[PDB]
Scaffold this active site. Structure first.
Site, PDB file in Angstrom:
ATOM      1  CE  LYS A  91      -0.939   0.657   5.064  1.00 23.56           C
ATOM      2  NZ  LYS A  91      -0.968  -0.066   6.402  1.00 23.56           N
ATOM      3  CE1 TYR A 115      12.275  31.294   3.725  1.00 27.44           C
ATOM      4  CE2 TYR A 115      12.009  28.909   3.930  1.00 27.44           C
ATOM      5  CZ  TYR A 115      12.013  30.049   3.149  1.00 27.44           C
ATOM      6  OH  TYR A 115      11.804  29.960   1.787  1.00 27.44           O
TER       7      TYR A 115
HETATM    8  C1  LIG Z   1       9.876  29.198  -2.155  1.00 31.79           C
HETATM    9  C2  LIG Z   1      10.335  30.424  -2.888  1.00 31.79           C
HETATM   10  C3  LIG Z   1       9.451  31.618  -3.196  1.00 31.79           C
HETATM   11  C4  LIG Z   1       7.964  31.718  -2.843  1.00 31.79           C
HETATM   12  O1  LIG Z   1       7.632  31.362  -1.493  1.00 31.79           O
HETATM   13  P1  LIG Z   1       6.826  32.335  -0.526  1.00 31.79           P
HETATM   14  O2  LIG Z   1       7.560  32.199   0.799  1.00 31.79           O
HETATM   15  O3  LIG Z   1       5.442  31.742  -0.625  1.00 31.79           O
HETATM   16  O4  LIG Z   1       6.968  33.691  -1.121  1.00 31.79           O
HETATM   17  C5  LIG Z   1      10.003  32.703  -3.882  1.00 31.79           C
HETATM   18  N1  LIG Z   1      11.280  32.736  -4.267  1.00 31.79           N
HETATM   19  C6  LIG Z   1      12.153  31.737  -4.067  1.00 31.79           C
HETATM   20  C7  LIG Z   1      13.549  31.893  -4.550  1.00 31.79           C
HETATM   21  C8  LIG Z   1      11.747  30.521  -3.361  1.00 31.79           C
HETATM   22  O5  LIG Z   1      12.682  29.565  -3.150  1.00 31.79           O
HETATM   23  C1  LIG Z   2      -0.763  -0.558   7.583  1.00 35.54           C
HETATM   24  C2  LIG Z   2      -1.340  -1.960   7.514  1.00 35.54           C
HETATM   25  C3  LIG Z   2      -0.534  -3.221   7.715  1.00 35.54           C
HETATM   26  C4  LIG Z   2       0.955  -3.162   7.990  1.00 35.54           C
HETATM   27  O1  LIG Z   2       1.291  -2.786   9.331  1.00 35.54           O
HETATM   28  P1  LIG Z   2       2.851  -2.714   9.725  1.00 35.54           P
HETATM   29  O2  LIG Z   2       2.896  -2.262  11.159  1.00 35.54           O
HETATM   30  O3  LIG Z   2       3.429  -1.736   8.762  1.00 35.54           O
HETATM   31  O4  LIG Z   2       3.390  -4.083   9.471  1.00 35.54           O
HETATM   32  C5  LIG Z   2      -1.141  -4.495   7.630  1.00 35.54           C
HETATM   33  N1  LIG Z   2      -2.447  -4.672   7.376  1.00 35.54           N
HETATM   34  C6  LIG Z   2      -3.283  -3.631   7.175  1.00 35.54           C
HETATM   35  C7  LIG Z   2      -4.732  -3.939   6.939  1.00 35.54           C
HETATM   36  C8  LIG Z   2      -2.788  -2.222   7.239  1.00 35.54           C
HETATM   37  O5  LIG Z   2      -3.640  -1.189   7.074  1.00 35.54           O
END
Ligand SMILES: *Cc1c(COP(=O)(O)O)cnc(C)c1O
Ligand SMILES: *Cc1c(COP(=O)(O)O)cnc(C)c1O
Ligand SMILES: [Cl-]
Ligand SMILES: [Cl-]
Lengths: 381, 384
Positions: free
Chosen positions: B39, B276
């Site tokens: 999955k 940031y």
């Molecule tokens: C991620 C990014 C942005 C836009 O992101 P905001 O924080 O939503 O403005 C603008 N310029 C650069 C270079 C970026 O890496």
């Molecule tokens: C997520 C899931 C598993 C696997 O569980 P693990 O802890 O990753 O082994 C098995 N069966 C079902 C139905 C699940 O949703």
């Protein structure tokens, strides 16, 4: 078919509304539609089309693969549109970029040598943008000795006719905290470093430093071009800056799902992994078929809000890989009923910011990481 | 061409480790068949490739959540063995029940609406359905509650068998607290699973398989194995919980290695902020490495200031905030060449951190770390 479980509705009309709102706030500047990271989880190409339609004259991406896909789009985006990409590593497809007429950021000498080398091989010149490190301290070229050298190497490459430096640019570290000291510091250092490069003979088409929060709150910062990313998707960079409504902005993504299961359980019956919620008395449980594999953050266990059946419900206990549960008081909606995780706000839904808070993170992460297993549905194309 | 996107970053998927794990797991559950749970794109490792490997090494069942995932397995080119059983459990109204019955999928049903929809689809299709009743033993997520609801569902199933529209091929459940060993609920769910299964067989249902065991169950509870085990995370070589143990404790080797190439190495003075909000400022003069992966790539932003990365022979840790596409590490004063390998996690044996180390830095479980590695990080498959 796959939409019946869940979907991300991408309202491209809201997007265009936002681009226009933003072109208003920055009237003396061009606008770049930042469509990196699959347009922040909204779908790169569709959103890029909408953003050009509404007045964006530049597109922005991180990787060169993203930018090349924009240039390869069918139907084509206008050939006259400028596409910039900044996140390069050694051996990257610099030739393909110069051939595809991309604007490429260069912030370091290895890149200058690689891009120049590629322009030779290709025969056509490169459009290059020097990234200046104004204080952020991430990517970017440091001032003094490194900037001197890079500006110079760029000047020689222009002499030799291999590239034209089309921009000088930077990025803010703390623009989302309004009036923080560093904003003014970075900004005057951007003016120093740009002044230096123009004074030594470089003639760029555009200077730019502004991200979303800058664009919204600092008209001094606009210069020739703005890069409002998150704001274009109708989400506020920070609640300290404001709501989207404060800047004439409308969230583009609505994340919704259909209840897989509604069932009555007695009291003292545990819910989800680790039994971190047990039912207070007899009650009803709703199964929402989205989990952390779909980008529903596991940090929003026990806190995430969902509009179901007319009232806000909150996640009951832990979020699983594919599902979570909500306590429905005793209400008994039909299975198949709509569970809206977030949206614009106007139908009583939570917003992306509400999930950001529940998960202890920023709304940027909420929308960007919505999984590829959640199909996107585009409305008002 | 696609050998170009790997230069930034990649998830190396070692399918030989996966086969080693499926064998280790078949050993721990010797009296049972094994289902390879693929999955969520095989937990971020790639559904089809991992499914092939798991069959190759003895998995006789495949497991998915959505019917779309399971149908894609059945449509795989080259084909998986037609003789292999594929189960899917996460259904909503109006779902493709007909296409499932036609494609010979085992479908979970835990509620009466689904029983009516699946039966309705078997009629339209003409061929019978393979159905697995999910029992709610205590988890309280998507099964059928005991008593009045189980009675009714078992009965509706019996009628559908009479009319020749379906055969109930399994009875099954899922543990809530198996990852915390000896927690009371484990025993509780387990005896309620025995009551509810006994009831359904006693009323005339004849299943091929009973099953309740996830990974932690499979590793720690031989009582829980029954006819079939569903060890998901353990198949990808990661431990369901440090309380259960390390992967090494159960003969298991992590399948995913997440690595990237340094975009930038640069010297910065002291008192210079990083990323940031300036949540890291450099203590004295130092070097900074730019790793070109961020939260859009599934590097959790909660691992800001804490996430470990092996660079240049030493563990570095994230300096300040993680951005959408990148983060920074303080490199002491070391000066590796840009293009150098930055290994975020792997098996452990080359000095790298593991997925669990990132789970801790981000305040979450390793399941989330591997599953949410972004689709923008290309997967490279080794030992296929
Ligand atoms: C991620 C990014 C942005 C836009 O992101 P905001 O924080 O939503 O403005 C603008 N310029 C650069 C270079 C970026 O890496
Ligand atoms: C997520 C899931 C598993 C696997 O569980 P693990 O802890 O990753 O082994 C098995 N069966 C079902 C139905 C699940 O949703
Ligand atoms: Cl910078
Ligand atoms: Cl359940």
């Amino acid at each position: 078919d796959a939409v019946l479980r869940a979907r991300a509705e991408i309202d491209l009309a809201a997007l265009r509304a936002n681009v226009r709102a933003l072109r208003e706030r920055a009237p003396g500047a061009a606008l770049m539609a930042v469509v990196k990271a699959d347009a922040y989880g909204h779908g790169a190409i569709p959103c890029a089309r909408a953003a050009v339609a509404a007045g964006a004259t530049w597109l922005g991406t991180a990787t060169p693969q993203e930018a090349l896909a924009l240039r390869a789009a069918e139907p084509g985006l206008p050939d006259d549109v400028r596409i910039m990409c900044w996140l390069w590593t050694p051996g990257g497809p610099w030739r393909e970029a110069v051939e595809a007429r991309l604007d490429v950021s260069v912030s370091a000498m290895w890149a200058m040598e690689e891009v120049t080398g590629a322009a030779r091989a290709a025969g056509v010149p490169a459009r290059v943008q020097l990234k200046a490190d104004t204080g952020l301290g991430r990517g970017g070229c440091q001032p003094g000795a490194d900037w001197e050298r890079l500006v110079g190497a760029a000047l020689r490459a222009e002499e030799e006719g291999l590239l034209r430096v089309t921009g000088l640019w930077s990025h803010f570290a703390c623009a989302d905290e309004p009036g923080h000291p560093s904003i003014a510091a970075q900004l005057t250092r951007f003016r120093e470093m740009t002044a230096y490069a123009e004074q030594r003979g470089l003639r760029p088409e555009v200077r730019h430093i502004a991200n979303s929060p800058a664009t919204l709150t600092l008209p001094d910062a606009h210069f020739d071009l703005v890069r409002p990313g998150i704001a274009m998707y109708g989400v506020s960079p920070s609640p300290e800056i404001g709501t989207p409504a404060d800047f004439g902005l409308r969230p583009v993504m609505t994340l919704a799902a259909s209840l897989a299961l509604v069932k009555q359980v007695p009291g003292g019956h545990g819910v989800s992994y680790g039994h971190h919620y047990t039912t207070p008395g007899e009650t009803t449980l709703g199964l929402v078929p989205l989990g952390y594999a779909d980008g529903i953050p596991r940090h929003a266990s026990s806190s995430g809000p969902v509009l179901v059946d007319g009232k806000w419900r909150t996640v009951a206990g832990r979020i699983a890989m594919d599902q979570f549960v909500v306590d429905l008081g005793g209400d008994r909606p039909e299975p198949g009923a709509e569970a809206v995780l977030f949206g614009p706000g106007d139908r009583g839904e939570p917003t992306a910011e509400d999930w950001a808070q529940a998960a202890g993170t920023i709304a940027y992460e909420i929308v960007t990481r919505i999984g590829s297993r959640v199909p996107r549905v585009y409305v008002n194309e």
